[PDB]
């Protein structure tokens, strides 16, 4: 199962060849994974006005088919990895109206959870809730 | 007399027709003013991350001109008015390359001194360095 | 009554303060203007491609409150003038949660219908369909 | 040796952690390259306009070090593979100031040379120009 971010491709996201502007694909990564914690960790983001922070390590992307404005993309979200205080998720960009759905591309993504002090940012372990919530989106075999 | 940001349009800039989307040159005024801090108001800067918060007030923009990918536009940034805790900025956005210098747009942007109260915000006096950098406009 | 384009605020639309950067909200008016279209006038959409081009003469907007990352915003059209090749919208930006509905900032936008003809742009009139659901 | 473009970071790239949000350092790439062209390949740039595109076929970017407004960082381009149709880069992404030159992050980018014939993107191996101002940031051991 994936946690499913529907996006539709707005005129701003769209570069003069007339498809999407390749780095637009990785502030989708950043609204799914947002999105995610409203509906299922809303403790969490909350906590992240009062100390917690969830860091980006690294992200990826592949293109394989061009987007256009006015498609239904669904950034379709699964769990890679959880160890420890990191978090590894995986991307499906899918295009799910006009026409026949079509993977546009695929994205991963690491993040910390880390806290601040005078020391510096801490590593501490992943919030109970949001672990609870990453759990029901792993894919086993 | 006025303050010259230099932005070179990039293609992430331009919608399918070719042309600069709208929007972007809203976001430029922005890139004219804080650029302007760093220039000429740095203890300003430096007070922005400790209580101080400039809020905008409005802006209005004026479109003559369409921008192309890899133009090189000059924001240039004049001092209508200083108004107590309040500042006007309007701007030209002209074409310097490629062909003649041409006025793509206009524009305009209040924008308020506030520093950060119990639990909301409260006007303060346009702090004496950054009124000091809008004397020499 | 108005035309209702909903935007949840993301992270990368808040800056350092907390709140929503100002150049967003002239963004959103894009997106309910081209939002508009794809719901009530699809033939002018499609006449995008070929041709049409809906040209911005000006916009503005006004400030009033702050947003914050997960705001739910309705940006709220409504049609202010309809004259010749051009059109006039006026936009609330609503946040309708969390807590009570808040008029954060107001906008507005002019428009110019455009198709080319030659080695130029040149004023074509507001498309029949387009005339037709602006009224509504 | 790479090319260097400087980037100053805008309050509109930092979030409410104070910090940049990651998407901007993809965006940058696309600047980096961009502003290459205009540099060392500038008939490359005019073919753009005219049946050339460049298909970005993937994306990646590590995050080391936290950047902040006003922060000069260089993106600094190498040039990794040149493989017929395709180019692969790196990037590292240095704060100069203020205070010690701080590396940020690191990231690749591989593109693809397309044409439009009709409605199809046929491959088209890169051209001369960009081939040859390239190659002058290649790694030398």
Redesign the interface.
């Known amino acids: 199962d994936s946690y499913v971010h529907r996006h539709?491709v707005?005129?701003?996201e769209?570069?003069?060849?007339?498809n999407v502007?390749?780095?637009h694909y990785?502030?989708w990564?950043?609204?799914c994974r947002?999105?995610f914690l409203?509906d299922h960790a809303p403790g969490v983001?909350a906590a992240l006005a009062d100390g917690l922070?969830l860091?980006?390590?690294?992200?990826?992307?592949?293109?394989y088919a061009e987007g256009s404005?006015?498609d239904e993309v669904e950034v379709r979200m699964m769990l890679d990895r959880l160890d420890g205080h990191r978090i590894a998720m995986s991307f499906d960009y899918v295009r799910v109206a006009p026409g026949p759905p079509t993977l546009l591309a695929q994205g991963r993504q690491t993040v910390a959870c880390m806290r601040r002090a005078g020391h510096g940012l801490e590593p501490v372990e992943v919030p109970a809730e949001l672990r609870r919530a990453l759990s029901r989106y792993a894919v086993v075999a």
Chains 1, 4 share one sequence.
């Open positions: 539709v707005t005129f701003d769209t570069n003069l060849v007339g502007y390749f780095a990785l502030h990564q950043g609204h947002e999105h409203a983001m922070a860091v980006t390590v690294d992200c990826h992307a592949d293109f404005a006015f």
